[PDB]
Symmetry: D3
Subunit: 186 residues, 6 copies
């Protein structure tokens, strides 16, 4: 059962930080996310990627985990990235406590009955994902009007950019999400 | 005078690591890249981004600097990102020692008379950038045919990803490249 | 409470055939599909649509139910139609007996590890959906290579058509899928 | 002279209802529409399709035949479906009594000097045809403003969906419209 | 009464060369093409355009008139330009002596049962029109395979170019084709 | 070092007017623009093209050379035409006296800090280049609001159309711009 289009390094072929992450994941969530194995081909690059990704998505910042995972699900849905859709879908179901809303966002946020703020975030995520050449300063105005300040905007644009990065890496290399994600928070 | 659509933090409003980076830049290239100011709005996120970007793009890896900057220029050109097209254009001109070749890649790699290897890199960069939902394992075969191994592919996909992240952050926030970049290596 | 952008007719405002359909649904699946209410605005048109849809999708024909629902899910995913993606997702999960496979097809069939036959069906469904002006007789050859005969092709093209009709009607009119569909066959 | 990419069933290979339709067409219009032969490969499915199509397009409802054929011509022009463009073009020329207006709609409704209502119908047909993921309840407001009620909207969205179905079936299978349509109502 | 979105100059407001052209047209075809009035707003630019257009499209060159008008009709159809689709449709009907073939090319050359040579011309015209950034030297090989020499290719690319110019000028300025064109060669 | 995908005629294979143009260019700018050689394959057609192009772009009319070259750079950037981007980029740098502004327009005019008028011109150039089927009389209103009269509009739409012509001819035939253009006006 392949999890990648490239060979996946074993424990002997990854640095300490990657093995520690594997152990931590196993102990806390009961499995090792396949991205932590498949994307470990270049170990130091992986560790640098994780350091930034973990800070931006998982550690405290200026947007809530619900807001962040909403963006993740929208971007990953537009780009039709399987790994990211499935894994961030599990996260969004968990953080919203509403599996059906999360599923609806995965299809089309316009039809998911979101708040005004959520709609502003989803719309801007989709625009910057699809039409990066066309965004302008004018597009920041709706974000301020639903209450995002400069730090929240700075975080938002990074999260959208990040999923444009991870969608591409995951899709290019055929990353396969773990079976557990499909069943989580349902 | 504007270099960003958001307020730019001064020395007192960024962490020490950012101040150290500014000093290192000034000492090495003679000026502080505008992105190091404009994107320092969220300081710790900025430093985590920089750690990864620097490692993937500037430090030794599996692709040459010329190869990485070729990909940077293709991606930033497709996405029409001013900051990245201008600054990475400077870099590609330096690493190729051929301003006209770099300028041609900025418009259309198809017409820039590239090597077979460079054409494979450029073609894949453009596809992954424009059509992330449609790339498959078959698309790796041309990369292998020009001699890219697994580490080189792993790096490549991250570089393409990274420019899809930075093109979005820089365009979303109206980042303005330093005047020096337009003149370097010409 | 809303299930449609138009007023929904009650029992007194639909023909008897629609009331009989509601009763049959309740008795067979335990609830009345929301489309049977929301799309009954023009009653006789509704019953003619249902006659054709039921025959093509639910009754014996030349493709299996699994094959039909695969196509439904691909089409509805490309078009980002909430009602159809959710309800046919339920159906595909049931007919495959594999929720994770169905969920993967919902994001990107290219990454769902399908059989050669399923990949041919999914690829053609997506092309006919996105690029109707560009399909030609040559595009039938892969279908014949996976064993589809003339009756199977005839059915296939109608199924793809039908989802291009229902995705449009349901999205245009903001049809909301029943909560049950999100939970079925998981 | 082929009329389809699939074999066309003869009189011995179609059900009674199809042969009766052939006879009726011949007696009343002087020829048998090729779709009635080419799409008869799956007989019962054909009869179910015709039952719905005939009710929606040809029998009394909530939009006039001129309005319906306007939509048909717009959708079929966007999708570049030959069978449907040619045959519904003949219908529109007949119902408008103005061949040049009908021809102009076939090219681009924006340039055909239509009424406000006609423009609202054409614009919405083209939007739902091209961008089904993007339509929302807001798009119904212009339709109400040119006087369409809920039944007229319900009919409209079906006619647009229907041509998205028939354009696809006709194009996929290389259906060829009869010579008579090209000369009718000129 | 309108034939343009800009004011149309009368005989007193154009140069003598334009008046002579109007007289020549009236004498040869029985009416003055509306473009000769509407596009004469800048008189000397108009006469330079006409000199080139007439030479490339009407006077002896390396492609036949039928071949040139086929390309005209493909291009104008893809771009949905009313003036050019209608007027060049008339021309193609005349040069093919087959109105139904010309009408079919106007919708989709893929379905018009063309010769191998005509299909190569039509396919290239559409690609160069839609995807100018993606054409390469490889795309000339099919043209050479149907017998086009260097002069024929040189002419072809200019004809495709020219319709991309005239489709834009005519659509931008709302040019209205004469009623005669809709009826000619039918 | 090839300058074209087709053979390039020598002095013995071109008419007098082409040889005179070569001589004039050499004497006045110090080199012969490669387009004057590569596009001379069909001599009379070339001379007719040059006659119109030279009048519209180089000789006095209703827009300034800065305005015209701005449009050239925008259109050529959207279409990613190397010959035209590089050569009109040199022209724009010269006429603006601001190399960095010209370079920024080549990437994305939205980020180049243009005047209101310049923005109106760039936006309309890009729209008519990308979406010719969608422009209407309404799009002329912004042009009038930044002060363009009917002659200026007539000229503008021709210049946009012209670059849609030259981008296509140049790209189709692999025209290579002279080394001098890359270094001019820097």
């Amino acid at each position: 059962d392949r999890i990648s289009s490239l060979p996946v390094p074993d424990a002997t072929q990854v640095p300490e930080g990657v093995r520690k992450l594997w152990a931590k994941a196993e102990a806390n969530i009961g499995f090792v996310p396949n991205v932590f194995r498949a994307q470990a081909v270049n170990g130091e690059q992986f560790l640098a990627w994780w350091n930034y990704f973990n800070l931006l998505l998982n550690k405290e910042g200026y947007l809530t985990n619900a807001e962040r995972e909403l963006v993740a699900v929208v971007v990953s849905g537009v780009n039709r990235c399987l790994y990211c859709a499935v894994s961030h879908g599990a996260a969004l179901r968990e953080f919203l406590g509403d599996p059906q809303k999360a599923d609806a966002v995965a299809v089309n946020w316009r039809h998911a009955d979101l708040t005004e703020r959520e709609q502003a975030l989803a719309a801007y995520a989709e625009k910057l994902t699809r039409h990066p050449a066309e965004v302008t300063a004018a597009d920041l105005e709706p974000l301020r009007a639903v209450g995002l300040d400069d730090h929240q905007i700075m975080e938002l644009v990074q999260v959208i950019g990040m999923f444009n990065l991870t969608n591409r890496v995951s899709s290019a290399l055929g990353f396969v999400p773990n079976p557990e994600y499909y069943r989580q928070a349902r």
